[PDB]
RNA sequence: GGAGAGGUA
DNA sequence: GGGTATTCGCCGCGTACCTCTCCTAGCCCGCAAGTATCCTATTCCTTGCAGCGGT
DNA sequence: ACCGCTGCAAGGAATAGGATACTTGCGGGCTATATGGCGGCGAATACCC
């Protein structure tokens, strides 16, 4: 009964930023990469398979595109196990012999350390450094790899969201590769294109979100479908059975007698350790270990290596292996309760088995057929009806228009919710492009770095009802961020007062954030954060803060000032009212500039 | 373990290493074992009578399983490579035994031509006639020539006429299976019943388990397929594993000892027993490898193959590579590391060079010198010291 | 009667079931005239002692891990007032009695006004209390026919 | 609560009290309606019922 | 605005 | 095929007035599940000095 | 007379929680098929010859 529902928060608006990044991207020329016939031919010699023509079609679709000065944002989405990785490696190779810092993002650790091995096995003959960042790397390691990012000693970096901690200033990006893109929302996708607009982007998944599928069908982004499975891989015989340990036991005995390994989906981190022993008396003959995202971030290293070195048959696991881990020995999934899963998730679950000549059985343990809900049911005969090699894009198109693609200039990539026009998207984009290119004004994110951290946990922006015109909203944002006098803040104030009547609360708070930003830059204040419990201010090395009067504050109110670091001052104030918090920082910084020196 | 050995030995030799693709289906299953694998299965059984060398890995379940009675293998199979020393009239009388008709202008199934030096055939299996052109009691050409225009499309090295299944699927074999059904099992009126299904001619999933009813002859224990000088190499153990599997088979048999829909043959019919297995096991000389000390008698040799020391790395100690850095210093023989993967080599390549160790990748374990650090790329799992010749393997798993 | 009709309810897997102990009407939150003024039902909360078993899985059909019991509420039922009226929304309403077909089997005949003949056609309805009706009738050409619902 | 509240609130035989006497309410609580679910209707009733 | 019920001539 | 007979399905079924009560699912917000990141905190390896004994 | 040896202070490193995101599904809170008519007439089969 502790649900505690009905909140509200609209701390940021996204459409302005997404227009800004797209207008920046279309403005900047991309990079006509250099192609090598022969040095890359020796790299082609290295790959120990033979390409399908559809893989080759993807390859020459990528390469002849990436050697052009335009904007390359390509969907190389195919089906699972179709060798989709190697085309990405080929693009990376051709980019990196131009020394252009390919960035690869994966939605988990597991892909990063397996693809670390994959890339590192691939580039064993070339003077290129490939590195991986995660929580498995030590922080000491992280400090120096992010350093040699800036000196550009690392040429290829792969990582989790740990790369998008935004303190990673690269030397020269030319290529971005996203693997299994059907995560991240939108912000984690476009955070890297924010810092470099003209960079090239390669997008890999097996099951795209409907939003990028619609935008692929919009002509904004290129598409290469991959069919023609590369090998002797059949079709994972889907079996949707009501839960029975005997069926389970015979499946496990079938796999162990085959010698292969077992994926056991449980998707319940608390209860999976109980799930281990209750599976253990059912199959005492097996070798089973436990894997999820909540060991002590070293156990799973042993677990995955031991599993990959065949030290145990069965892995009970959560959806942390939904990302596509290959390990071609195993051929049997046991989905304990398939009911609460999307069809893309289901196609992925079928995706990790197979990957080989051997026939892979799939076991979809469900509740009783009336007991399963109709959503889970029609999902189950959806996946059961369509068991075909190369059926992924069919399933993705079925996912589309049943859930509806999200809005074209915002988050929430699935869901209809009455988006804006695609023709309107064209018109708004081109108006953004030529208005931005007009005076060549710097971007939003460029004026986030130059601007001091002035986040005060406020909903403070230009709301949609106040100005529906997102384009001139961005124009106002650029003029407001460009403002270098309080007087031009004032003419902007009377300007919007003229143009739209009364100014709402987020807009006027945005105005006074600009005001405090002005004196913060003017004195030398570098970082000023606040919250309910107080807040923390970071000065410069050359501040206009009185040191003697700073100690005087520390000894007149030790409960309200604590220097913890050289310029790192925590004030502790029960800041409950946002307006009084604004006047707190305003009047305080007024006294501080009364002590300006 | 077979799978492990299949690429363990592939690391450690050059000789042809090949398995037996057995039924991935379970004993008395209700599934198909994926026909093409069976097409790979019998191919092995084509060469098992005639190879003069070669490494074949089979596990105990395969030896437990019975096979085809081999007259079908010599009778309905025209897999044939270029090194088949065979005359002209020999294939004439063999395809006469197969029932083929002599047409010089082959158009229909079961036809062949043989004039001068040329032999042609049109099979019962496919829609393609083939020029053979036998030379001096041997075969020299495999010409995919036209059905009417007599022009070659492609010259082949080995022809593969394998029929689609273990059993003959022809109507006489259908009647034989019906006869053996009415001999052993019973007939009930049901369309879904497999007796009436093969009366309709169709092929159910677990059709392979009613195998011998298609031959009217006992199934071989496949050792009649054997060459005269094989050499059996015991791995793991037998007088536990075979009995264990026998228990599993009988457990499944009595478990599915129900359902006159698909009644099941006794396992003595479709399998060995452990008793007769060990009865046929004295027909061939054998090498038994065990990880224990045999004390003393003739035909034993205990080889000093001692375990590695405590080799482990840890970041808790100040210098993590202490065990290897001191174990190599006290080491007299060559040290082969045998990295599994190639780029993993550099995972050791930037790791031993931290302690100024640069092992060079060699190919053959016989290439080891008296004192040097070398490595393989292969599939080893645990290292050990060969104190007989002071050789050493330090695998990946010797470091974690 | 209704609770013994429905409860106990088994599960589909059959590893547990919910049974019933007793019921008890709560005290009304308001009385008749205050409900009359305010504009709300004169209602009693229903508090039922439900009881859920848990069987053991690996143990055979019929064993007990655990069983729980509590008084749990479901639904506001209006109480009839002291006279015969229900106060439902401040409007006193009366549920008038109905006079309907007693379930059973009823033989009948449309008295010769069909089939242009003057021949009578006897029919028989099996009328359940709750369920599907059943009709038998004679054809004008003496053929017995059935229809469901 | 829905299947009770609908019937006691708005049903075919849950009717408003005729309450302009003692007699009117006491002859309304004793009323025997042949209408309702499971019964006949006002415009589909013959001379005989 | 639509159903449901009751009423008058 | 054609002719008559039965059978199914739609067409209608009074006007005017007054009073009263009652007219819902869906969807999306936030919970659950998962995944990743960011902290303090407290626990835990680990080592140096302090001091205590030994010939 | 001090060397050598262990015990605890220190001090950090890690790891263990607590928050911050992102994906699916679901539930609640609002809020955006019933069985009791009948006669007439006409079109559409049923059957029979
Ligand atoms: N041209 C080819 N011919 C035969 N087999 C191939 C070929 N290309 C790739 N393969 C095999 O198919 C497998 C596909 O795995 P990989 O992860 O490389 O691509 P993918 O599975 O399509 O990508 P994802 O893991 O994102 O689904 C590879 O492990 C490789 O062994
Ligand atoms: Mg009158």
Q: What distance in Å separates the CA atoms of residue A520 and residue A533, rounded to the nearest whole number?
A: 21
* A206, burial (CB in 10 Å: exposed 0-12, middle 13-18, buried 19+): buried
Q: Look at the block and give the residue holding tokens 């990044």.
A: A21
Using alpha carbons, select from A481, A569, A552 the residue that is nearest to residue A521: A481
Domain that holds residue A455: 422-595
Residue C121's H or E segment, with its range, is: strand C121-127
User: How many residues are recorded in chain B?
Assistant: 400
Q: What is the DSSP string of A461-480?
A: S--TTT---HHHHHHHHHHH
- Under 8 Å CB-to-CB from A271, ≥6 apart: which residues? none
In this structure, are residues A514 and A544 in contact, taking their beta carbons and an 8 Å threshold?
no
Nearest residue of C to residue A368 by CA position? C12
Q: What distance in Å separates the CA atoms of residue A560 and residue A574, rounded to the nearest whole number?
A: 10
Q: Look at the block and give the residue holding tokens 């004195």.
A: A523
Contact A368 C12 (CB under 8 A): yes
* C-to-N gaps above 2.5 Å in chain C, after residues: none
CA torsion through residues A374, A375, A377, A381, sign: positive
Q: What distance in Å separates the CA atoms of residue A300 and residue A178, rounded to the nearest whole number?
A: 24
In this structure, are residues A75 and A222 in contact, taking their beta carbons and an 8 Å threshold?
yes
Q: Tell me whether A368 touches chain C (CB under 8 Å).
A: yes
Partners of A182 in the β-ladder: none
Nucleotides of F strand lying within 7 Å of any protein CB atom:
6-7, 13-14, 20-23, 28-31, 33-38, 45-47
Whether omega before C8 lies within 30 degrees of 0, making that bond cis, reads yes
Q: What distance in Å separates the CA atoms of residue B56 and residue D5, rounded to the nearest whole number?
A: 79
- For residue C143, give the DSSP letter: -
| Mutation to test the D interface, candidates C88, C96, C108, C129, most D Cβ within 10 Å | C96
Q: What are the respective helix, strand and coil percentages of chain A, to the nearest 5? A: 45, 10, 45
**What phi and psi values does residue A24 have, to the nearest 5 degrees?**
-70, -40
Partners of C139 in the β-ladder: none
User: How many residues are recorded in chain A?
Assistant: 597
Partners of A240 in the β-ladder: A364
**What phi and psi values does residue B396 have, to the nearest 5 degrees?**
-60, -45
User: Which of A117, A120, A358 comes nearest B24 by C-beta?
Assistant: A358
Contact D29 C86 (CB under 8 A): no
The ligand 1 site (C-beta within 6 Å) comprises A 49-52, 55, 80-86, 179, 206, 230-231, 324, 326, 355
Separation of CA D13 and C1' G34 in angstroms? 18
Q: What distance in Å separates the CA atoms of residue A239 and residue A247, rounded to the nearest whole number?
A: 11
In this structure, are residues A506 and A459 in contact, taking their beta carbons and an 8 Å threshold?
yes
Distances (CA, A) of A574 to A354, A531, A535: 59, 9, 10
Rg (CA), chain B: 28
**What phi and psi values does residue A365 have, to the nearest 5 degrees?**
-75, 125
Longest CA span, chain C: 72
Separation of CA C76 and C1' E2 in angstroms? 29
Contact A117 B34 (CB under 8 A): no
Closest ligand, as measured to the CA of A111: 1
Q: Do the bridges between strand C134-138 and strand C121-127 make them parallel or antiparallel, or are there none, so unpaired? A: antiparallel
| Shortest Cα–Cα distance, C133 to chain A (Å) | 27
Q: Tell me whether A140 touches chain C (CB under 8 Å).
A: no
User: Which of A122, A258, A329 comes nearest B24 by C-beta?
Assistant: A258
Q: What angle do CA B339, B344, B348 make, to 5 degrees?
A: 75
**DSSP 3-state assignment of A43?**
helix
Distances (CA, A) of B206 to A73, A258, B203: 50, 17, 9
A82's tokens: 């179709």
Atom of ligand 1 nearest to the CA of A226: 22
CATH code: domain of residue A551: 3.90.1150.50
Q: What distance in Å separates the CA atoms of residue A520 and residue A534, rounded to the nearest whole number?
A: 18
| Shortest Cα–Cα distance, D47 to chain C (Å) | 15
Q: Look at the block and give the residue holding tokens 């290596």.
A: A305
N-term to C-term CA, chain D: 36
Closest ligand, as measured to the CA of A52: 1
Contact D5 C97 (CB under 8 A): no
Separation of CA C45 and C1' G16 in angstroms? 48
Cα(A1) to centroid of ligand 1, in Å? 48
CB atoms within 10 A of CB A213: 24
- Under 8 Å CB-to-CB from B397, ≥6 apart: which residues? A309, B381, B382
In this structure, are residues B138 and B85 in contact, taking their beta carbons and an 8 Å threshold?
yes
Q: Tell me whether A281 touches chain C (CB under 8 Å).
A: yes
Please name the residue whose Cα sits nearest to atom 19 of ligand 1. A83
Chains in touch with A (≥3 Cβ pairs < 8 A): B, C
C43's tokens: 């209602």
Q: What distance in Å separates the CA atoms of residue A61 and residue B293, rounded to the nearest whole number?
A: 63
Q: What is the DSSP string of A494-530?
A: HHHHHHHSSPPHHHHHHHHHHHHHHHHHHHT--EEEE
Using alpha carbons, select from A52, A125, A130 the residue that is nearest to residue A87: A52
Q: What is the DSSP string of B321-341?
A: THHHHHHTTT--S-EE--BSS
**DSSP 3-state assignment of B118?**
strand
Domain that holds residue B154: 78-161
Q: What distance in Å separates the CA atoms of residue A115 and residue A102, rounded to the nearest whole number?
A: 14
Torsional class of A569: left (φ above 0), alpha (ψ -120 to 50), beta (otherwise): beta
Contact C13 A367 (CB under 8 A): yes
Please name the residue whose Cα sits nearest to atom 5 of ligand 1. A230
Q: What distance in Å separates the CA atoms of residue A190 and residue A182, rounded to the nearest whole number?
A: 13
* Helix A422-439 with A15-27: angle, nearest 10 deg: 60
Q: What distance in Å separates the CA atoms of residue A372 and residue A380, rounded to the nearest whole number?
A: 10
Q: Which nucleotide is nearest to D18 (CA to C1')?
A: E6
- For residue A405, give the DSSP letter: B
**Which spans in A196-310 are helix H?**
210-216, 245-258, 272-282, 299-308
Using alpha carbons, select from A294, A352, A366, A288 the residue that is nearest to residue A322: A352
Q: What distance in Å separates the CA atoms of residue A114 and residue B344, rounded to the nearest whole number?
A: 12
Q: Which nucleotide is nearest to A184 (CA to C1')?
A: G22
Q: What distance in Å separates the CA atoms of residue C115 and residue A161, rounded to the nearest whole number?
A: 84
Contact B34 A359 (CB under 8 A): yes
Residue C144's H or E segment, with its range, is: strand C144-148
| Mutation to test the A interface, candidates B206, B240, B343, B395, most A Cβ within 10 Å | B343
Q: Which nucleotide is nearest to D14 (CA to C1')?
A: E5
User: Which of C86, C96, C99 comes nearest D8 by C-beta?
Assistant: C86
Q: What angle do CA B77, B82, B84 make, to 5 degrees?
A: 60
Atom of ligand 1 nearest to the CA of A50: 1
A178's tokens: 């996203």
Contact B343 A358 (CB under 8 A): no
Using alpha carbons, select from A287, A352, A296 the residue that is nearest to residue A319: A352
| Shortest Cα–Cα distance, C59 to chain A (Å) | 13
- Structure-determination approach: cryo-EM
Cα(A396) to centroid of ligand 1, in Å? 20
CB atoms within 10 A of CB A329: 18
CATH code: domain of residue B140: 3.30.2060.10
Contact A243 C13 (CB under 8 A): yes
In this structure, are residues B392 and B385 in contact, taking their beta carbons and an 8 Å threshold?
yes
Torsional class of A120: left (φ above 0), alpha (ψ -120 to 50), beta (otherwise): alpha
Q: What distance in Å separates the CA atoms of residue A272 and residue A230, rounded to the nearest whole number?
A: 36
Q: Which nucleotide is nearest to A165 (CA to C1')?
A: F37
Residue D25's H or E segment, with its range, is: helix D23-28
CATH code: domain of residue A122: 3.40.50.300
A270's tokens: 């608390």
A279's tokens: 């599976």
Using alpha carbons, select from A534, A488, A546 the residue that is nearest to residue A514: A488
Q: What distance in Å separates the CA atoms of residue C105 and residue A83, rounded to the nearest whole number?
A: 73
- For residue A143, give the DSSP letter: H
Residue A201's H or E segment, with its range, is: strand A200-204
Separation of CA D2 and C1' G38 in angstroms? 38
């Amino acid at each position: 009964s502790r649900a505690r529902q009905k909140a509200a928060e609209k701390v940021r608006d996204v459409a302005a930023e997404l227009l800004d990044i797209y207008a920046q991207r279309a403005a900047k020329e991309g990079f006509a990469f250099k192609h090598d016939r022969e040095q890359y031919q020796l790299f082609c010699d290295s790959f120990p398979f033979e390409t399908t023509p559809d893989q080759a079609q993807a390859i020459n679709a990528v390469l002849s595109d990436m050697c052009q000065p335009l904007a390359m944002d390509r969907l190389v989405c195919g089906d699972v196990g179709f060798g989709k990785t190697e085309v990405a490696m080929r693009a990376a190779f051709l980019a990196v012999d131009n020394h252009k810092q390919v960035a690869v993002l994966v939605p988990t650790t597991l892909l990063a350390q397996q693809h670390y091995d994959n890339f590192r096995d691939r580039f064993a003959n070339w003077p290129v450094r490939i590195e991986m960042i995660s929580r498995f790397r030590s922080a000491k390691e992280q400090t120096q790899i992010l350093a040699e990012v800036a000196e550009g000693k690392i040429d290829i970096l792969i990582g989790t969201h740990k790369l998008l901690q935004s303190d990673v200033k690269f030397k020269d990006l030319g290529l971005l590769i996203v693997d299994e893109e059907h995560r991240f929302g939108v912000r984690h996708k476009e955070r890297i294109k924010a810092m470099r607009a003209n960079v090239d982007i390669l997008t890999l998944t097996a099951t795209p979100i409907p939003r990028t599928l619609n935008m692929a069908m919009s002509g904004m982004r290129d598409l290469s479908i991959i069919a023609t499975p590369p090998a002797r891989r059949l079709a994972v015989k889907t079996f949707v059975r009501e839960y029975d340990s005997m069926v389970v036991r015979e499946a496990i005995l079938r796999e162990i007698l085959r010698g292969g390994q077992v994926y056991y989906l449980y998707n319940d981190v608390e209860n999976i350790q109980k799930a281990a022993e209750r599976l253990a008396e059912l199959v005492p003959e097996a070798r089973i270990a436990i894997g999820h995202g909540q060991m002590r971030e070293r156990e799973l290293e042993r677990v995955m290596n031991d599993f990959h070195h065949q030290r145990f048959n069965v892995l009970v696991c959560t959806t942390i292996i939904e990302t596509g881990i290959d390990i071609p020995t195993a051929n049997t999934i046991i989905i304990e309760r398939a009911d609460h899963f999307g069809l893309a998730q289901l196609h992925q679950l079928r995706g990790r088995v197979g990957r080989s000549h051997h026939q892979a059985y799939a076991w979809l343990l469900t509740p009783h057929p009336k007991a399963m809900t109709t959503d889970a049911q029609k999902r189950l005969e959806a996946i059961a009806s369509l068991e075909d090699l190369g059926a992924g894009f069919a399933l993705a198109t079925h996912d589309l228009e049943i859930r509806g693609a999200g809005e074209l200039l915002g988050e929430e990539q699935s869901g209809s919710m009455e988006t804006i026009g695609f023709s309107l998207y064209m018109e708004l984009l081109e108006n953004a492009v030529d208005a931005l290119k007009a005076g060549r004004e710097p971007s939003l994110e460029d004026l986030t770095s130059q601007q001091t951290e002035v986040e005060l946990r406020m909903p403070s922006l230009l709301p949609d009802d106040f100005i529906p015109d997102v384009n001139t909203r961005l124009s106002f944002y650029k003029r407001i961020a460009s403002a270098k006098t309080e007087n031009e803040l004032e003419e902007i104030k009377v300007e919007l007062i003229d143009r739209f009547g009364l100014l709402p609360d987020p807009a006027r708070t945005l105005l006074d954030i600009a005001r405090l930003r002005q004196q913060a830059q003017k004195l030398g204040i570098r970082k000023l954060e606040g919250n309910e419990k107080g807040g923390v201010i970071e000065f410069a090395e050359k501040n206009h803060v009185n040191p003697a009067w700073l100690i005087g504050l520390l000894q007149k109110q030790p409960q309200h000032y604590r220097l913890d670091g050289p310029t790192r001052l925590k004030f502790i104030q029960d800041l409950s009212e946002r307006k009084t918090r604004i006047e707190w920082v305003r009047q305080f910084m007024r006294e501080l500039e009364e002590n300006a020196i | 373990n077979a799978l492990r050995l299949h690429d363990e030995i592939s690391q450690f030799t050059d000789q042809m290493v090949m398995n037996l693709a057995d039924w991935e289906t379970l004993p008395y299953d209700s599934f198909s074992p994926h026909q093409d694998i069976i097409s790979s299965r019998l191919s092995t059984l084509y060469q098992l009578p005639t190879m003069q060398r070669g490494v074949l890995i089979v596990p105990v379940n395969t030896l437990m399983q019975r096979v085809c009675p081999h007259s079908f293998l010599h009778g309905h199979a025209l897999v044939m490579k270029k090194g088949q020393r065979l005359s002209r009239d020999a294939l004439r009388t063999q395809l006469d035994s197969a029932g083929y008709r002599h047409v010089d202008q082959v158009m229909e199934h079961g036809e062949y031509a043989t004039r001068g030096a040329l032999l042609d055939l049109f099979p019962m299996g496919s829609e393609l006639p083939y020029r053979l052109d036998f030379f001096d009691d041997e075969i020299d050409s495999l010409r995919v020539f036209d059905v009417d225009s007599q022009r070659t499309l492609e010259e082949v090295e080995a022809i593969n006429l394998l029929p689609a299944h273990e059993f003959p699927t022809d109507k006489a074999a259908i009647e034989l299976f019906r006869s053996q059904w009415r001999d052993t099992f019973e007939v009930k009126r049901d369309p879904e019943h497999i007796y009436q299904q093969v009366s309709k001619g169709t092929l159910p999933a677990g059709i392979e388990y009613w195998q011998p009813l298609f031959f009217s002859e006992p199934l071989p224990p496949l050792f009649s397929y054997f060459p005269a000088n094989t050499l059996l190499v015991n791995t793991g153990d037998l007088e536990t594993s075979a009995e264990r599997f026998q228990a599993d088979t009988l457990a499944r048999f009595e478990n599915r000892g129900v359902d006159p829909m698909r009644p099941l043959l006794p396992p003595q019919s479709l399998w060995l027993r452990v008793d007769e297995l060990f009865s046929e096991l004295k027909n061939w000389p054998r090498v038994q490898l065990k990880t224990e000390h045999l004390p003393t008698k003739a035909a034993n040799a205990n080889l000093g193959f001692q375990k590695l020391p405590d080799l482990a790395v840890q970041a808790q100690q100040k210098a993590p590579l202490d065990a290897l850095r001191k174990f190599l210093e006290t080491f007299d023989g060559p040290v082969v590391f045998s990295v599994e993967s190639e780029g993993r080599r550099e995972a050791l390549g930037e790791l031993l060079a931290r302690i100024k160790i640069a092992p060079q990748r060699i190919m053959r374990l016989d290439e080891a010198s008296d004192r040097g650090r070398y490595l393989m790329i292969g599939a080893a799992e645990h290292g050990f010291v060969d104190t007989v010749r002071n050789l050493a393997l330090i695998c990946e798993s010797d470091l974690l | 009667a209704a609770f013994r009709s429905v409860f106990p309810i088994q599960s589909y897997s059959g590893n547990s079931e919910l049974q019933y102990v007793s019921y008890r009407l709560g005290e009304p939150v308001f009385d008749v005239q205050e409900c009359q003024i305010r504009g709300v039902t004169y209602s009693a909360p229903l508090r039922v002692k439900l009881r859920l078993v848990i069987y053991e899985r690996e143990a055979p059909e019929g064993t007990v891990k655990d069983i729980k019991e509590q008084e749990v509420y479901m639904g506001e039922i209006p109480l009839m007032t002291d006279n015969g009226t229900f106060v439902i929304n401040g409007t006193e309403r009366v549920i008038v009695s109905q006079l309907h077909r007693s379930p059973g089997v009823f033989f009948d005949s449309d008295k010769g006004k069909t089939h242009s003949s003057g021949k009578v056609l006897y029919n028989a309805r099996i009328i359940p209390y709750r369920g599907s009706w059943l009709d038998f009738e004679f054809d004008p050409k003496d053929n017995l026919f059935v229809r469901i619902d | 609560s829905a299947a009770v509240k609908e019937f006691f609130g708005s049903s075919q035989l849950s009717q408003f009290m005729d309450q302009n006497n003692p007699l009117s309410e006491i002859t309304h609580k004793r009323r025997i309606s042949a209408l309702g679910p499971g019964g006949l209707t006002r415009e589909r009733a013959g001379f005989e019922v």
